[PDB]
Every structure is written in C-alpha cells, then in structure tokens.
Design a protein around this ligand. Structure first.
Ligand SMILES: Cc1cc2nc3c(=O)[nH]c(=O)nc-3n(C[C@H](O)[C@H](O)[C@H](O)COP(=O)(O)O)c2cc1C
Ligand SMILES: Cc1cc2nc3c(=O)[nH]c(=O)nc-3n(C[C@H](O)[C@H](O)[C@H](O)COP(=O)(O)O)c2cc1C
Ligand SMILES: O=C(O)c1cccnc1
Ligand SMILES: O=C(O)c1cccnc1
Lengths: 216, 216
C-alpha cells in the first residue's frame, strides 16, 4: 500500500557505507528521474548520479566546511543524485522535446505536432518575457521530480534524504554546470540506513489537517 | 511495483463524472497531502479539497480566458485539490511546527526542542533576510508535495492531472487566500478517466537519459 510507504518513510540521518544498491535498483532510480511529469513535458532538468567513491567525493565538496553533517550522508550512501534545473529556457530544448514526442508517436498529424510546439512556446515565452519567472518555474518542476523520486525510492524499499544543505555554487563549479546552463538545487543520497540513523525509530510529525486543509 | 506505476500513470485529459472516489480513497489522498516531506518540516502549505459540485465550480472559475480547457477537468473530476503556498513566513508557523514535533514525542529534552527551533530559524531567516527567496523557497516545497501526490494517487489506482493552466488571481480571490496569507500554485483534479481521455492510450514520451543524466 502506498499509504503505508508514505507513513513509514523518513529522512535518513546516517547510511551504511557497505550497503550498495543492486544493479537493478540503480536502473530503477534512473527510470524514476526520467519519467517524472513536468509542466508542458518541458523536462527542464539534468541529473548527476554519483555511484563511485570519487564521484560522491566530488559532490561532497559542496558540503565541506559549512554543511559537514550533509558530507557524511553524501559519502556514506550508495548513490547520490544531484537534481539540476536549466537556467534559461532555449528554443533548442523545446524543439528537442516536441521532436521526442513525435518520435514516440504522440502526434496523429503534422497539424497535431505544430499545435503542440505552438502551445509550448506560448507558455514558455509567458514565463520568460511576461512573468520574468522562467528560472523559478523550471526549478519548481525539478522539485516536483524530487517529490516523485523520494516516494518512488521509498516504495522500492530504499532509504534516502533530500538535502538543500549544500553550497550550490561549489557543486556547480565542481561539475561546470553554470557553463552548460544548469544549477544544482537538491542532493538526494540514496541507500540503506545504519544503526546510527536516530531518525529511523522516531515518530513522524505533521501539522493536523484542520490547520492545513479546507474541504469545499 | 512503483516503477510500473511511474511508467503507466498519465495526465488525464477527461474524467468520468459518474466515477467517485470511495470514502477510503478520499481519506488516503488527504493523508498523502499531509505526510509529504518538506525542508525543515516547514510544511509551508494549505490545501483546498473540492468535492461538491459547488466547490468544484468555485475552483473552475479560475479556468476563465486562456485556461478554458482546464475547466472540464476541474468540474468532471471526483476531487480537485488546490495546492497553496504560504506567501511570507511567520514565526508563529515555525513555533507551531516545533510544538507539533514536541507533542508527537520527537525530542528527548527541552535542549533538543530549543535546538530544533533555533536550527529552523537559522535556515528560514537565511531565505527571507539574505537570499530574499522565501516565497520561492516555500513554493518549491509545495511542488515537491505535488510530485509526491501524483505518484501516490497513481499508486492508489486513481487518475489525476496537474494543472498550471489556471488563473491564480481568480482562484485566490474566490477563496480569500491573499488575506489568509496563501497563494494557489497547482490544481490537481483526481478521479477516473473517461473513454474521451485521448492521453490514456498515447505513448509516454521523455528525453533519453544520455541527454538528461551523467553517471560519475
Ligand atoms: C527540500 C528538502 C530539503 C531538506 N534538507 C535537509 C537537509 O539538508 N538535512 C536533513 O537532515 N534533512 C533535510 N530534509 C529532510 C526534512 O527535514 C524532512 O523531509 C522533514 O523533517 C520531514 O521528515 P521526513 O522526511 O522524515 O518525513 C530536507 C527536506 C526537503 C523536502
Ligand atoms: C506543474 C505541471 C503543470 C501542468 N499543467 C498542465 C495543464 O495545465 N494542463 C494539462 O493538460 N496538463 C498539464 N500538465 C501535464 C503535463 O503536460 C504532463 O505532466 C507531461 O506532458 C508528461 O505527461 P504525463 O503526465 O502523462 O507523463 C502539467 C504538468 C505539470 C508537472
Ligand atoms: O503541460 C501543459 O499542457 C500545460 C502547462 C502549463 C500551462 N498550460 C498547459
Ligand atoms: O531540513 C533540514 O534538515 C535542512 C533544511 C535546509 C538546510 N539544512 C537542513
């Protein structure tokens, strides 16, 4: 039951450095990142999946100094995913999405294809020119992906933790993201928790529905 | 299996208005909204769950003008969730979260509780005072919740569609959100697709992982 999963998952505070994902699980986590939905199917994202110790070290540089509790989590875990957002929306990226939709056989005619591209241009241009929010709007889609991912990995029976506690500037420069047109937003170490994870046996806490939720 | 679910879910273009959530399902979707994770467990969110004809109509007012093709989706679905973000953060909201954690028994001492509050203040204050990004940061958490929700509902065997195509100004005023300190971001009709959902029988399209994903 997916509710069981939601009610039992937690942010892992410590991972077992000897516990690695199976080859199949590593396939599955990539599938989840890929198939997240997104406004307009714009998919405005890059993922860095670090599974080597050298790889994870490069990511963990972003936590050295000020985020050092995040460091252990990034280094101990089997796989560390950096979620990145496109910085500006390029008409090349919109073309590449609609051509992918076409290749997959989503459009019955070229009329259908041109109409999809036109719609996508309209909203994308609205974010950039009008609302001046295209970076933010693209970042929101990455956070949607994160939410999808966390539940997904929890349902696979894997431990994870979302981390905003890292230096985006450091991690960007470590992978040359600014120049490729990306920016790191969230790091998600994935694996199996150790006996040092105090949060594994703590009760979940949420505000009551009568505060957060109106039924009409 | 959750990967099956991720691969099979779709954005529903038309719902069957006769097909209601069971009373149990209506409780389950509320559970998912509440138990989404968030940075600092800040839960900077409100939900409107519209299940009456009256209620859905009030939401569908937001799909005036350019957003007309949203309207059907909002009226025909069994349940329609408006995801709202807090507009600025109040110290009252941070208190209410830490008091909730305490009531749920997450802290062994007052030292534990005071240190959690102070940590939450540190990052929260960083967003408002330094980065001037607290609105955006709270909205990002709401989108994480949306991602969690869409997969969750899909795992329950329910259809849904995320909608950014609505008039947030109209929906806010309809529900007096500005005055209560919220703003609508995403509308998610939930129910069962009809045979007129053209998207139910189309292939899923995503960019290939050789574009989106770097393994290190
Ligand atoms: C975007 C995001 C950022 C987070 N950053 C951190 C982090 O830097 N360090 C950490 O220990 N937990 C982090 N968390 C975990 C949260 O504190 C956690 O989701 C929240 O307290 C709810 O608990 P749960 O995830 O165990 O249900 C983050 C959560 C989210 C959603
Ligand atoms: C934030 C968000 C906003 C969306 N808004 C709309 C919308 O207003 N109308 C619509 O029909 N679909 C909307 N979509 C659906 C997307 O087009 C869909 O998620 C994407 O094409 C991928 O297809 P799938 O959800 O079937 O996998 C939205 C998706 C997201 C993530
Ligand atoms: O994905 C869509 O079709 C979409 C996204 C934003 C606004 N209107 C439509
Ligand atoms: O939730 C946390 O633990 C958190 C959030 C932001 C930054 N550092 C920690």
């Amino acid at each position: 039951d997916i509710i069981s999963v939601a009610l039992k998952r937690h942010s892992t505070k410590a991972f077992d450095a000897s516990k690695k994902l199976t080859p199949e699980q590593a396939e599955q986590i990539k599938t989840l990142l890929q198939y997240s939905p997104s406004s307009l199917n714009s998919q405005p994202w890059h993922f860095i999946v670090a599974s080597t110790e050298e790889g994870k070290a490069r990511v963990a540089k972003s936590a050295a100094g000020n985020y050092v509790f995040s460091e252990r989590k990034m280094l101990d875990a089997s796989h560390v995913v950096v979620f990145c957002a496109k910085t500006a929306m390029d008409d090349v990226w919109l073309k590449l999405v609609v051509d992918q939709e076409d290749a997959d056989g989503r459009f019955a005619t070229p009329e259908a294809k041109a109409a999809n591209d036109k719609g996508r241009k309209f909203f994308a241009d609205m974010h950039r020119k009008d609302l001046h929010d295209d970076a933010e709007w693209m970042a929101k889609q990455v956070y949607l992906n994160v939410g999808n991912f966390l539940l997904g990995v929890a349902a696979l029976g894997l431990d994870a933790v979302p981390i905003e506690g890292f230096d985006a500037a450091i991690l960007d420069a470590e992978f040359g993201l600014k120049e490729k047109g990306y920016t790191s937003l969230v790091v998600v170490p994935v694996g199996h928790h150790s006996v040092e994870d105090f949060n594994a046996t703590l009760p979940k806490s949420r505000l009551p529905q009568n505060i957060t939720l109106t039924e009409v």
